[PDB]
Design a binder for this molecule. Structure first.
Ligand code: XV1
Ligand code: XV1
Ligand code: XV1
Lengths: 118, 115, 117
């Protein structure tokens, strides 16, 4: 699982432990061990949301499975809550794109997660 | 809908009004209200296109529907036109990835748009 | 085809020649002419892999076709090898998302690559 946050919030406003908190929370939420989880936060971005440059975030979550209607709603509540609490971004100025990745289309460690066939 | 531009053009070369013009033109082209539209411009990037570092752009447009053959060709004309005029990037050094998003896969305001 | 690398490795550590080597190696691996290949490298990123801030990279490769089981494993070996050699990033701290794009969903030069209908 991989979570990316792009925001116009300044770098100094990103709490020091934010990456670890996202990692732990995403581990719990996805049921995947933390060792698999990647997080990427990009502050100070030039963005508009609804024509306004008030604090906002455009995000993506990639996962192999564990993606879908009810699950995604749960992720949104969790992640909007963290962005609101830690970065002070209103949940209605956050977008999160969810991607259900096929194991064959995720590369890692010189190979992919499609190990079953040649 | 959501549009991202990554370019090696310097931030200083990004004109006042650019984000707003993108927002307005995207609202027009996609038919979605301006309040929906998110735009994100990332200048000063380390990029090569065809092995050359002349001005170029790599872009994406996500949308719930309104993605398709003729529509995408129309978006490309619109967006390449703007990037050429405003950022002086040649249209043949722009790539735009189009994504048709399912509403259940776009999160917003503590939920998704399937709800 | 376009390849993006986001990494917490500092810009100073990105070696002269890196983008060009990516460009030429990707042309070779995809069998596509270099003229088509776009590369984008983003250093100095605030990111974690497994909760650790040791060097890591999150990457993507988009291609119209030439995406699939064996091909992607080959791309991974190639690109992890280059990231390891050039940026000193361990292959097990690299993720690469592969996207098989439809020609109708890739814009270029005022249009797309779907010209048939
Ligand atoms: C999550 C993940 C991380 C980076 C890019 C794309 C992804 F889907 C993930 C990583 C590894 C993994 C191994 C086995 C089963 N599932 C996995 C993931 O969902
Ligand atoms: C590769 C490519 C570049 C940018 C975004 C998405 C892509 F798939 C690519 C570029 C151009 C092209 C022309 C004809 C046939 N295939 C092509 C590609 O795969
Ligand atoms: C715009 C949008 C933003 C991020 C990802 C994908 C998108 F399409 C958008 C926001 C909300 C919305 C609601 C209903 C129908 N379409 C919508 C959009 O296109």
């Amino acid at each position: 699982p991989m979570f990316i946050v792009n925001t116009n919030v300044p770098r100094a406003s990103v709490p020091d432990g934010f990456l670890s908190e996202l990692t732990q929370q995403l581990a719990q939420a996805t049921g995947k061990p933390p060792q698999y989880i990647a997080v990427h936060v990009v502050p100070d971005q030039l963005m508009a949301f609804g024509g306004s440059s008030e604090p906002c975030a455009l995000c993506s979550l990639h996962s192999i499975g564990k993606i879908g209607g009810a699950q995604n709603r749960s992720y949104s509540k969790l992640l909007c809550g963290l962005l609101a609490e830690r970065l002070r971004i209103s949940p209605d100025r956050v977008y999160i794109n969810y991607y259900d990745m096929n194991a064959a289309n995720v590369g890692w460690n010189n190979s992919t997660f499609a190990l079953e066939h040649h």
